[PDB]
Amino acid sequence: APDCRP
Amino acid sequence: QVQLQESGGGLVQPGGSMKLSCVASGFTFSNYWMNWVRQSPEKGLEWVAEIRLKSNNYATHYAESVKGRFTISRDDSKSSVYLQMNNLRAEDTGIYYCTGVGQFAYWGQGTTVTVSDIVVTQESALTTSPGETVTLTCRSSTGAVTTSNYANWVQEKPDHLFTGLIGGTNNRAPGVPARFSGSLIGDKAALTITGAQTEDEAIYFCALWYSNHWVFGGGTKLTVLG
Ligand SMILES: *[C@H]1O[C@H](CO)[C@H](O)[C@H](O)[C@H]1NC(C)=O
């Protein structure tokens, strides 16, 4: 996955 | 709230070098990956490079078109990201944007550089009126779009002003109006405007993730009449 941090 | 301020563009010769800079404020820069994306009339919106976090050893990835010529770097103590561009070609001409966060909420104003395969498909144009519901779609040449493509939607208004709307398929970016929503419908990604407004006249781009790179669609010109 990509940058999935909120 | 958030500002990404680019600099360093110009008018350069084929074969030359140039370094772009982007300074961030209003969010915790060091906690997010950063990207460079470029726009040209010929090749549309094109993802160029990403850089990850200190905890990832600042891992980088590049588009095949720039690999071995471009280098992305960051300085967390200055909240800045950079793009070193060597051996420039005519095809590198465009407006260069730094962008990131969930996954393309925030965009810089762009800096112009003038030098002198998966296909993601969107509707070329759609026409609506105020108060209507309009749905834009985003198809992959690879097959069905899934949540593993982390579909993003971004809006371009004059003059080359980008704002991210939706990331991770259906997550609305902070401060984005409630009339915008993301979905997956019939194995395409979709952006719906539930009650279109005159100010929503704009170009809308989708971006899909494939393992380690982004592919942007061609954009949809939405006209809002009446
Ligand atoms: C983002 O959240 C996702 C949930 O899909 C994963 O837990 C992922 O590990 C998180 N992203 C990063 C960059 O750590």
Side-chain angles (χ1 to χ4, degrees):
Chain A
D3 192 358
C4 51
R5 111 163 353 149
Chain B
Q1 164 66 257
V2 169
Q3 284 183 239
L4 292 169
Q5 302 178 240
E6 284 104 348
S7 55
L11 203 212
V12 293
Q13 246 60 274
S17 274
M18 174 167 268
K19 196 175 176 176
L20 309 184
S21 295
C22 170
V23 186
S25 59
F27 73 104
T28 308
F29 174 87
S30 69
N31 287 350
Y32 297 95
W33 303 9
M34 293 297 295
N35 308 264
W36 287 92
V37 178
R38 65 190 180 182
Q39 181 169 47
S40 59
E42 34 274 304
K43 300 187 284 181
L45 267 189
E46 187 179 9
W47 173 89
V48 175
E50 69 173 34
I51 185 160
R52 333 253 275 207
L53 313 183
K54 186 186 167 79
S55 55
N56 310 118
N57 218 302
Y58 296 118
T60 59
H61 290 280
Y62 298 92
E64 199 68 24
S65 59
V66 305
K67 191 179 169 179
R69 306 156 57 228
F70 286 17
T71 305
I72 187 172
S73 61
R74 67 194 295 162
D75 180 349
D76 290 344
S77 76
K78 293 186 153 160
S79 300
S80 298
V81 59
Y82 308 96
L83 189 69
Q84 177 64 51
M85 301 175 311
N86 303 325
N87 198 16
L88 287 163
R89 309 171 174 186
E91 71 180 75
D92 297 319
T93 292
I95 308 172
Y96 282 72
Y97 303 90
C98 53
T99 175
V101 185
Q103 287 69 53
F104 298 102
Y106 307 132
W107 293 67
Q109 87 288 353
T111 189
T112 304
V113 175
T114 305
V115 187
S116 181
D117 281 336
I118 296 157
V119 179
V120 171
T121 298
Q122 299 182 248
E123 291 88 356
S124 287
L126 296 169
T127 302
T128 191
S129 300
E132 296 298 300
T133 295
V134 62
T135 296
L136 288 60
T137 71
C138 179
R139 162 176 300 287
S140 177
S141 61
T142 63
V145 179
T146 72
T147 54
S148 298
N149 301 117
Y150 301 86
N152 277 242
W153 291 90
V154 307
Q155 186 197 60
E156 189 180 17
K157 286 183 159 176
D159 185 9
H160 296 278
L161 296 183
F162 285 86
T163 75
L165 300 175
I166 300 293
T169 309
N170 60 10
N171 262 259
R172 187 151 31 94
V176 170
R179 66 182 176 282
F180 297 100
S181 66
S183 62
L184 290 182
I185 302 174
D187 304 322
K188 294 194 285 180
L191 172 70
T192 298
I193 310 176
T194 300
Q197 304 183 187
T198 58
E199 62 263 39
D200 299 334
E201 180 157 316
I203 304 170
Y204 295 81
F205 293 90
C206 69
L208 301 182
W209 172 257
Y210 298 91
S211 307
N212 53 358
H213 65 109
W214 291 96
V215 183
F216 280 79
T220 297
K221 175 95 268 297
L222 183 68
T223 303
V224 183
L225 286 62

